[PDB]
Structures are given as C-alpha cells and as structure tokens.
Amino acid sequence: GLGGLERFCSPGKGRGLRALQPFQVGDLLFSCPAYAYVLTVNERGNHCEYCFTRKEGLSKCGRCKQAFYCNVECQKEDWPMHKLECSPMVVFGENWNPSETVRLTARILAKQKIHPERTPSEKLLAVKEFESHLDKLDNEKKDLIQSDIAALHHFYSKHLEFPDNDSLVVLFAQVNCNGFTIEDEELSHLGSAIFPDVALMNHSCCPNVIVTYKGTLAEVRAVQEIKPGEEVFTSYIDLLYPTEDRNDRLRDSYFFTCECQECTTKDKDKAKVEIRKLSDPPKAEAIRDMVRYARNVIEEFRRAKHYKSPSELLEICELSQEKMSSVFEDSNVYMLHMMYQAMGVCLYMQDWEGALQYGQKIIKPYSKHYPLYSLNVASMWLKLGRLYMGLEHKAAGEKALKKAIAIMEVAHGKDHPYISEIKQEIESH
Ligand SMILES: O=C1COc2c(CCNCCN(C(=O)CCNCCc3ccc(Cl)c(Cl)c3)C3CCCCC3)ccc(O)c2N1
Ligand SMILES: C[S@@+](CC[C@H](N)C(=O)[O-])C[C@H]1O[C@@H](n2cnc3c(N)ncnc32)[C@H](O)[C@@H]1O
Ligand SMILES: [Zn+2]
Numbered sequence: 001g002l003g004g005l006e007r008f009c010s011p012g013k014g015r016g017l018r019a020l021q022p023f024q025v026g027d028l029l030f031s032c033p034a035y036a037y038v039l040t041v042n043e044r045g046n047h048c049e050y051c052f053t054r055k056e057g058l059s060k061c062g063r064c065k066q067a068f069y070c071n072v073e074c075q076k077e078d079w080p081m082h083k084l085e086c087s088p089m090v091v092f093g094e095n096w097n098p099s100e101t102v103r104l105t106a107r108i109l110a111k112q113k114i115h116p117e118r119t120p121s122e123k124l125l126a127v128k129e130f131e132s133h134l135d136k137l138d139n140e141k142k143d144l145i146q147s148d149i150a151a152l153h154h155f156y157s158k159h160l161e162f163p164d165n166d167s168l169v170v171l172f173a174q175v176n177c178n179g180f181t182i183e184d185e186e187l188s189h190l191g192s193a194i195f196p197d198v199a200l201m202n203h204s205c206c207p208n209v210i211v212t213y214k215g216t217l218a219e220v221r222a223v224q225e226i227k228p229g230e231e232v233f234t235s236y237i238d239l240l241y242p243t244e245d246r247n248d249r250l251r252d253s254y255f256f257t258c259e260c261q262e263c264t265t266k267d268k269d270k271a272k273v274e275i276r277k278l279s280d281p282p283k284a285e286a287i288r289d290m291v292r293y294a295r296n297v298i299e300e301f302r303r304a305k306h307y308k309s310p311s312e313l314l315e316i317c318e319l320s321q322e323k324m325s326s327v328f329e330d331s332n333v334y335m336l337h338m339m340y341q342a343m344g345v346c347l348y349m350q351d352w353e354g355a356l357q358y359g360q361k362i363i364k365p366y367s368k369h370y371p372l373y374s375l376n377v378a379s380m381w382l383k384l385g386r387l388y389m390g391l392e393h394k395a396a397g398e399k400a401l402k403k404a405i406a407i408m409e410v411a412h413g414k415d416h417p418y419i420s421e422i423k424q425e426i427e428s429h
C-alpha cells in the first residue's frame with residue numbers, strides 16, 4: 001500500500017482513502033505515476049508527448065509529424081503508446097478524429113496487454129476494480145459509450161485485441177468515473193490520464209487535499225490538517241457554484257449526491273447568488289426566473305463557442321450580464337461565469353487590456369466563494385500577474401504573482417517547477 005494511509009469502506013461512499021498519521025497543510029500525502037495518459041491534440045508541439053515537459057525546440061516524430069519529444073529517449077519510451085496513433089494519423093489524415101476518452105481508453109487496453117500485473121500506480125486500487133455505475137447508465141449515456149466503442153474499433157483495431165462489447169461498456173464507464181484531466185498552472189487542459197490510487201479518493205465540496213501534476217506524476221497535498229482516522233477528500237468539480245448546481249453536476253457525472261458540510265449547511269449559497277439591494281426588492285419568483293435564465297445562458301454559450309465568432313461570443317457575455325445585473329450583484333456566480341468566459345475570449349483575441357479589465361472584477365469574489373487554498377483562485381492571480389507584467393504594470397504584476405505563489409506553495413509544493421518559473425518571471429521583469 002501507501003505509508004501513513006489505507007483503503008477502507010466509507011459508509012455510503014463505497015471504498016475510500018483514510019489517514020493513519022497526521023498531515024499538515026502543504027504536506028505531500030502521496031504521489032501516483034500515470035497508469036495511462038494522453039497529451040491533448042491542441043498541446044502537441046508545446047509539451048513532450050512522453051514526459052509532458054513544456055519546452056521550446058521539441059523534436060517532431062518523422063513519420064506522423066504530429067508527436068513532439070524532448071529527445072530520442074522520450075521518443076523511444078513513448079513508442080509502445082504512440083504506435084497506436086502514428087501510422088493511423090497519416091493514413092486517415094483529416095479523417096483521424098477519435099475523442100480524447102477513446103484515445104485514453106486505447107492506451108488502457110494497450111497497457112493491460114503489455115503489463116497485466118499490478119503496477120506501482122495500483123498500490124491501493126486497481127484499474128480492474130474501478131467503479132463503473134454500469135447499472136445506473138441511461139439511454140443517452142449508453143448511446144455515447146456506443147459511439148466511443150465504434151470510434152475505438154474504427155481507429156485502434158491494428159494493435160488491440162478487443163474484449164466483448166459488454167466489457168467495453170464497463171471500461172468506458174470506469175474511465176468516465178475515474179479519469180483525470182491534467183491541467184497546467186493556469187488550469188489549461190493538457191491531457192487525460194488514469195491515476196488508480198488517486199481515484200480511490202472520495203469527493204467533498206470542502207476537500208482536505210488538492211491534486212496537482214509534476215509532468216505525468218499526480219501529487220496529493222493537504223489543504224486542511226488531516227488527523228488519523230479521517231477520510232481523505234478531494235473536489236471532483238468546480239466549487240464556485242451553489243449547492244443545487246454542484247449536486248446536479250455530481251449526480252450527472254458521478255451518480256451521487258454530496259452530503260458534505262457545504263452541501264448540508266448551504267452557507268455560501270446566499271452570497272453565491274447575491275441579489276441587488278433595490279428600493280423595490282426583487283420577488284422570489286423573479287430571482288428563480290433569473291437563476292433559470294443564468295443556467296440556460298451558461299449552456300447556450302458552451303454550445304456557441306464551437307461555432308460563433310469572438311465578437312458574437314463577447315456579445316452573449318455582455319448582453320446576458322446586462323439582463324442579469326437588474327436582479328444579480330456583480331459578485332454573483334452567474335455574473336462571474338460570464339465575465340470569466342468573456343476574459344477567455346479576450347485572451348484568445350490577444351486583447352490583453354480587455355482580459356485584464358475582466359480579471360480585475362473576478363478576483364475578489366473568487367477569493368470569497370472558493371476554499372482557502374484553491375487552484376481556481378491561484379490560477380486567476382497568475383493570469384492577472386502575467387497580464388499586468390505583459391502590460392508593463394510591474395508592481396501590480398509582482399503583487400498578483402506573489403498571491404499565486406502563496407497558494408501554489410501549499411498545493412504544488414514549495415519546490416514545484418511552476419513556482420521556479422513564476423519567481424523567474426518576477427526577477428526577469
Ligand atoms: O476519480 C476521480 C475522477 O474524477 C475526479 C476529478 C474530475 C476530473 N476528470 C474530468 C474529466 N472527465 C470527466 O469529467 C468525465 C465525466 N463524463 C461526463 C458525463 C458522463 C458520466 C458518466 C458516463 Cl458513463 C458518461 Cl458516458 C458521461 C473525463 C473525460 C474523458 C477522459 C477521462 C476523464 C477531479 C478530482 C478527482 O479526485 C477526481 N477523481
Ligand atoms: C472515482 S470513484 C471514488 C472511489 C469509490 N468510492 C470506489 O469505491 O471506487 C467515484 C465514485 O465514488 C462515489 N463517491 C465519491 N465521493 C462520494 C461522496 N461524497 N458521497 C457518495 N459517494 C461518493 C461515487 O459512487 C462516485 O461515482
Ligand atoms: Zn520528454
């Protein structure tokens with residue numbers, strides 16, 4: 001197993017991870033090497049396919065020209081996994097489009113063939129033991145899994161010996177239940193991976209640990225003091241949202257309702273859905289209508305980013321914020337969601353001033369809605385610092401970068417390469 005920790009039966013939460021020794025804020029509980037991992041398509045050329053090192057001058061694979069490495073060693077070591085895609089990418093050309101879930105699942109199947117025995121990534125929980133929620137699958141989810149199975153056969157039949165369709169549905173469901181996104185210091189999506197021992201941890205909206213990445217290695221650090229006998233919890237979702245929103249997401253993606261202190265007390269719900277202090281106060285039904293409108297625009301915008309222009313996307317943000325502002329305060333989470341989306345569009349358009357304008361409005365309400373040590377808060381401070389630095393506002397940039405560092409020292413560790421980069425940004429000016 002893992003020193004100072006153990007697998008146990010968590011009442012009403014299946015299997016979980018329990019502490020056997022105290023952990024202080026910032027302590028590393030454990031590390032978990034990726035069992036299977038894939039670099040996201042849009043990050044190719046920026047990070048090494050094998051070790052995820054972000055570097056300039058990465059060497060391109062000579063055959064496909066769509067895989068980049070540190071050197072010949074990273075190239076060689078990645079070959080058992082890269083071979084699943086190398087020739088297929090050149091053969092299918094423009095038609096090569098398997099989803100990231102399918103890409104990861106192909107790598108799980110390849111790893112099971114090469115290494116059927118328990119790996120150092122499975123000291124407490126094995127990939128084969130993963131919870132699937134197969135019995136809870138509705139028609140919509142089974143149809144999505146069937147599309148994924150067809151893409152798997154379509155793009156990965158060369159090297160893989162497929163189990164029956166029934167075993168594949170269990171696998172795709174286990175991957176959705178237990179799969180991780182690997183994010184960078186700005187929470188930008190890098191890829192997807194399987195960390196079996198990390199997937200043993202249950203969810204809480206007031207977590208006592210944070211998962212970070214050092215290349216393809218997952219690291220688990222305490223963000224609250226943990227005592228012997230206490231269960232180790234991480235957050236599976238974005239904690240900005242009120243209780244109902246959080247539980248709608250947990251029920252849909254993880255088939256459970258959270259009963260943590262935040263979900264039971266609903267303490268932060270009032271400030272999260274802050275209402276304007278108007279002479280004629282807004283009616284209860286007028287609030288409920290705006291909350292319904294707010295959830296609908298969030299989904300409308302989510303769809304729109306796939307086909308609308310940057311100006312159309314900014315229009316949706318501006319127009320929706322205007323309608324919401326008649327009922328909602330600026331610190332309200334639905335206002336903040338649109339502002340964050342608008343900042344993202346500005347960043348893409350390289351409208352640094354516009355991005356800074358939004359980020360400045362988001363930061364204080366983020367600090368109040370998120371937990372004490374939050375990667376969402378650290379990431380926003382970091383973006384702000386980088387925008388300030390890029391726009392020659394060095395004193396403001398240094399202050400924001402140091403706010404990011406203070407959180408990251410706890411979550412990523414004092415010695416994390418990301419902190420060394422940020423300190424170099426402060427020093428280089
Ligand atoms: O064990 C875990 C896993 O989740 C955690 C997370 C969430 C990170 N993973 C997010 C990426 N991801 C998903 O969210 C999959 C959810 N699928 C959406 C709805 C759905 C659910 C079930 C099925 Cl059946 C299907 Cl059809 C569709 C997947 C996208 C595809 C690649 C794999 C990840 C954070 C901290 C954690 O500690 C955990 N712990
Ligand atoms: C990644 S697994 C965590 C390990 C899991 N308990 C097991 O036995 O394999 C995610 C699943 O654990 C359960 N789970 C996680 N957190 C929970 C919580 N706070 N309350 C109830 N169930 C939870 C749900 O069934 C969820 O889909
Ligand atoms: Zn490398």
Ligand SMILES: [Zn+2]
Pocket residue numbers: 061062063064065066067082085086087
């Ligand atoms: Zn190649």
Ligand SMILES: [Zn+2]
Pocket residue numbers: 204205206258259260261262263
């Ligand atoms: Zn909760």
